[PDB]
Paper text:
Remarkably, mAb R5.011 potentiated the inhibitory effect of all eight of the most potent nAbs against 3D7 clone parasites, showing a clear synergistic effect despite itself showing no neutralizing capacity when tested alone. R5.011 binds PfRH5 primarily at the interface between the disordered N terminus and the rigid α-helical core at residues Y155–L162, a finding also confirmed by HDX-MS. All CDR loops except L3 contact PfRH5, with the predominant interaction mediated by H3. A high-resolution structure of unbound R5.011 Fab fragment was also determined and used, together with structures of R5.016 Fab fragment and PfRH5ΔNL, to provide model restraints. Binding is accompanied by a major change in the conformation of the H3 CDR loop of R5.011, which packs against residues Y155–D162. Indeed, live-cell imaging revealed that the time taken for merozoites to invade RBC is significantly longer (around 3-fold) in the presence of R5.011 versus a control mAb targeting Ebolavirus and versus non-neutralizing, non-potentiating anti-PfRH5 mAb R5.009. Overall, these data identify R5.011 as a novel antimalarial mAb that displays a new functionality by potentiating the effect of all tested anti-PfRH5 nAbs and pAb, as well as pAb directed against other merozoite antigens, despite having no intrinsic neutralizing properties when tested alone.
Author numbering:
A (entry chain A): 1 to 142, 149 to 228
B (entry chain B): 2 to 210
């Protein structure tokens, strides 16, 4: 039962370095090659290179020469990926994958080489942004009316939005965040309500940004 | 060595999808196929042109001859909706190469035009010497949209930030776009428009200072 298990998400500043781990189990680590593949967000798979698990000798794809380093710790059946002088374009999910046939199989030349088992992936985020709590703004409605709230310029993800402390759930679209060129996030939540904006039919959005201890209750009025 | 794949393939459920992978003398190489469902890691679905790893259904097949390799998927289910990638090993360079990938869409519902909501800057934001126009886009199918902003008929490219579409609980998509301006820029025009193009049709909304 082959398993490849990767280290968790990592957030790094431009210029820094990352080390990503890949622990193998359920097979002879030193009998199979380990490959590394990159996937930038919303893009295709890109082969980074392979490492010989018996010698430690790495082979890099074109352009993955210089800042990418493969290494091993065979005693703990673990393979490492290191990326130095990080740039914002290094923001990607990194997968490790076992390759078949193995080193000692004579069928390799004609039948090789495919990635039969993959790790779950490690997201490496490269950003110059610091922790920042958001500003929350009411989005006033102009037989139904839409009202909402804008959760502006925070870092990092996540934030949660609820309406009237949870008591309001029907007609609620909470939209995924946008990443701005500043490196900060923004999102909106909108509620469609029957046009009964009673002088006191209160609509409050509850915003939580846990990484900055932000909790905001905003009344949304016509 | 280059592998060329069509970016997009659409299929009616129960019908058969065909995904091609072109390469000079690809027939002389072993071709493998990976299925990647959203938010998940790739899974090997076909290796050595036509073999299936254990657990992969008989509906998945492949062929490889001359300059084209093909992944065929019979009686397509909603569960088959994913990105498919082909891969080869090059004995000359000792590289493994991936094609650019094909998004497979299983058309499980009719075309739905986006519903668009446009909000002007709030009083609170204007007080903090800032101005954001919020364009909320929902319930569109298929999951692809283009957004353009307009001021006094002119195209606005600066200060625009748009999300990728996202699958909602119903099987429709949502997206949003934000236009950041200074309070003076906001007040300097008669109206601002958010224009959302979906399958060649534009849904437009206007807001005025
Ligand atoms: C039907 As809806 C809540 O996605 O506008």
């Amino acid at each position: 039962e082959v398993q490849l298990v990767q280290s968790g998400s990592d957030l790094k500043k431009p210029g820094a370095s990352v080390k990503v781990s890949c622990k193998a189990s359920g097979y002879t680590f030193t009998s199979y090659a380990m490959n590394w593949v990159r996937q930038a967000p919303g893009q295709g798979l890109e082969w980074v290179g392979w490492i010989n698990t018996n010698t430690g000798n790495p082979t890099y794809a074109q352009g993955f020469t210089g800042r990418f380093v493969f290494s091993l710790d065979t005693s703990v059946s673990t393979a490492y990926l290191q990326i130095s002088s990080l740039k914002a374009e290094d923001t990607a999910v990194y997968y490790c994958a076992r390759e078949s046939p193995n080193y000692y199989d004579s069928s390799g030349y004609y039948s090789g080489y495919y990635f039969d088992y993959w790790g779950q992936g490690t997201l490496v985020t490269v950003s110059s942004a610091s922790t920042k709590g958001p500003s929350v703004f009411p989005l006033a409605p102009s037989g139904t009316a839409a009202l909402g709230c804008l959760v502006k310029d925070y870092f990092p993800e996540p934030v949660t939005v609820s309406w009237n402390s949870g008591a309001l759930t029907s007609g609620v679209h909470t939209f995924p965040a946008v990443l701005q060129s500043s490196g900060l996030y923004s999102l909106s939540s909108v509620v469609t309500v029957p046009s009964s904006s009673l002088g006191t039919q209160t609509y409050i959005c509850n915003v939580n940004h846990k990484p900055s201890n932000t909790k905001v209750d905003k009344k949304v009025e016509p | 060595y280059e592998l060329t794949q069509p970016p997009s393939v659409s299929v009616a459920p129960g019908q058969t999808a065909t995904i091609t992978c072109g390469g000079k003398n690809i027939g002389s190489k072993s071709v493998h196929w990976y299925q990647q469902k959203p938010g998940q890691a790739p899974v090997l679905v076909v290796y050595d042109d036509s073999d299936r790893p254990s657990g992969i259904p008989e509906r998945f097949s492949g062929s490889n001859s001359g300059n084209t390799a093909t992944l065929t998927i019979s009686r397509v289910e909603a569960g088959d909706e994913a990105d498919y990638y082909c891969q080869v090993w090059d004995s000359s360079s000792d590289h493994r190469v991936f094609g650019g990938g094909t998004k497979l869409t299983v058309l499980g519902q009719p075309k739905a035009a986006p519903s668009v909501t446009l909000f002007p800057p709030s009083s609170e934001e204007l007080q903090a010497n800032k101005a954001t126009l919020v364009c909320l886009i929902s319930d569109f199918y298929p999951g692809a949209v283009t957004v353009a902003w307009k001021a006094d008929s002119s195209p606005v490219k600066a200060g625009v930030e748009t999300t990728t579409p996202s699958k909602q609980s119903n099987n429709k998509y949502a997206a949003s776009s934000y236009l950041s301006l200074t309070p003076e820029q906001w007040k300097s025009h008669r109206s601002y428009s958010c224009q959302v193009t979906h399958e060649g049709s534009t849904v437009e909304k206007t807001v005025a200072p």
